[PDB]
Scaffold this active site. Structure first.
Site, mmCIF file in Angstrom:
data_model
loop_
_atom_site.group_PDB
_atom_site.id
_atom_site.type_symbol
_atom_site.label_atom_id
_atom_site.label_comp_id
_atom_site.label_asym_id
_atom_site.label_seq_id
_atom_site.Cartn_x
_atom_site.Cartn_y
_atom_site.Cartn_z
ATOM 1 N N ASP A 15 17.791 33.773 27.051
ATOM 2 C CA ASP A 15 17.464 34.196 28.421
ATOM 3 C C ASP A 15 15.969 34.290 28.756
ATOM 4 O OD1 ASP A 15 16.577 36.564 27.223
ATOM 5 O OD2 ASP A 15 18.446 37.673 27.815
ATOM 6 N N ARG A 29 12.015 35.431 32.490
ATOM 7 C CA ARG A 29 13.233 36.118 32.027
ATOM 8 C C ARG A 29 14.305 35.889 33.101
ATOM 9 N NH1 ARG A 29 17.495 38.412 31.042
ATOM 10 N NH2 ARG A 29 17.702 40.208 29.703
ATOM 11 N N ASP A 34 22.133 38.977 30.287
ATOM 12 C CA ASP A 34 21.614 39.379 28.953
ATOM 13 C C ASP A 34 22.327 38.518 27.931
ATOM 14 O OD1 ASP A 34 19.969 40.976 27.325
ATOM 15 O OD2 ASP A 34 21.635 42.248 26.852
ATOM 16 N N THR A 35 21.552 37.695 27.258
ATOM 17 C CA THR A 35 22.027 37.026 26.044
ATOM 18 C C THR A 35 21.800 37.880 24.803
ATOM 19 O OG1 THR A 35 19.894 35.803 25.882
ATOM 20 C CG2 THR A 35 21.764 34.695 26.934
ATOM 21 N N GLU A 37 20.282 38.780 21.213
ATOM 22 C CA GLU A 37 19.035 38.363 20.560
ATOM 23 C C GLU A 37 19.401 37.358 19.461
ATOM 24 O OE1 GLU A 37 15.965 39.482 21.865
ATOM 25 O OE2 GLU A 37 17.109 40.612 23.399
ATOM 26 N N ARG A 75 6.609 39.076 32.590
ATOM 27 C CA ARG A 75 7.548 37.941 32.680
ATOM 28 C C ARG A 75 7.948 37.715 34.120
ATOM 29 N NH1 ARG A 75 11.990 39.612 28.277
ATOM 30 N NH2 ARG A 75 12.208 41.166 29.911
HETATM 31 C C1 THP Z 1 16.298 41.079 33.525
HETATM 32 C C2 THP Z 1 15.263 42.204 33.694
HETATM 33 C C3 THP Z 1 14.696 42.881 32.607
HETATM 34 N N1 THP Z 1 13.777 43.862 32.819
HETATM 35 C C4 THP Z 1 13.267 44.679 31.718
HETATM 36 C C5 THP Z 1 14.228 45.845 31.464
HETATM 37 C C6 THP Z 1 14.202 46.010 29.972
HETATM 38 O O1 THP Z 1 13.184 46.971 29.628
HETATM 39 P P1 THP Z 1 13.057 47.465 28.086
HETATM 40 O O2 THP Z 1 12.222 46.414 27.404
HETATM 41 O O3 THP Z 1 12.318 48.761 28.305
HETATM 42 O O4 THP Z 1 14.439 47.561 27.547
HETATM 43 C C7 THP Z 1 13.865 44.610 29.456
HETATM 44 C C8 THP Z 1 15.100 43.861 29.015
HETATM 45 O O5 THP Z 1 14.764 42.511 28.708
HETATM 46 P P2 THP Z 1 15.223 41.756 27.385
HETATM 47 O O6 THP Z 1 16.739 41.691 27.467
HETATM 48 O O7 THP Z 1 14.514 40.404 27.425
HETATM 49 O O8 THP Z 1 14.762 42.679 26.250
HETATM 50 O O9 THP Z 1 13.283 43.939 30.547
HETATM 51 C C9 THP Z 1 13.419 44.222 34.134
HETATM 52 O O10 THP Z 1 12.573 45.142 34.337
HETATM 53 N N2 THP Z 1 13.885 43.529 35.184
HETATM 54 C C10 THP Z 1 14.811 42.567 35.039
HETATM 55 O O11 THP Z 1 15.287 42.022 36.057
HETATM 56 CA CA CA Z 2 18.268 39.570 25.760
#
Ligand code: THP
Ligand code: CA
EC number: 3.1.31.1
Length: 129
Positions: A15, A29, A34-35, A37, A75
């Site tokens: 993702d 992103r 959510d994929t 890891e 991102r």
């Molecule tokens: C998809 C997405 C993720 N994020 C943030 C929330 C999560 O914060 P935390 O890092 O504090 O968990 C993280 C999850 O992404 P990943 O699934 O790539 O880790 O990215 C956003 O803020 N907005 C979004 O739309």
């Molecule tokens: Ca992920």
């Protein structure tokens, strides 16, 4: 919403992908999914699926939603299309991603993705197996 051009720089994982957008390298992103890891079950299959989709694409496009365009990591937050097919949706439809991270204001494609998820789950595909 509007599709805008981009070109692949490199597949990262299920993702996240690095694209050139307005001439600048950016890590994107995928909105609303959510994929797993890469270290987790179906992570390698999700990574491979996204990788194949973006690498084989003649045309990559990105689409921002109405809200935040970047997250707290810097991102880009977008829907990505590979020859007109949405990666975010395709991952969900194949049971390689869950609908996730649905924030109000950046959720235009929510119900499209949920519909895909219901079918993946019906078919007991991958994550839903
Ligand atoms: C998809 C997405 C993720 N994020 C943030 C929330 C999560 O914060 P935390 O890092 O504090 O968990 C993280 C999850 O992404 P990943 O699934 O790539 O880790 O990215 C956003 O803020 N907005 C979004 O739309
Ligand atoms: Ca992920």
């Amino acid at each position: 919403l509007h599709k805008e051009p981009a070109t692949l720089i490199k597949a990262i994982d299920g993702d996240t992908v690095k694209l050139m957008y307005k001439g600048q390298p950016m890590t994107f992103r995928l909105l609303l999914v959510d994929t797993p890891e890469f270290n987790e079950k179906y992570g390698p299959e999700a990574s491979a699926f996204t990788k194949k989709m973006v690498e084989n694409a003649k045309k990559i496009e990105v689409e921002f939603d109405k809200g935040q365009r970047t997250d707290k990591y810097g991102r880009g937050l977008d829907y990505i299309y590979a020859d007109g097919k949405m990666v975010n949706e395709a991952l969900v439809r194949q049971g390689l991603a869950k609908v996730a991270y649905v924030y109000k204001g950046n959720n235009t494609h929510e119900q499209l993705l949920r519909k895909a998820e219901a079918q993946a789950k019906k078919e007991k595909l991958n994550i839903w197996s």
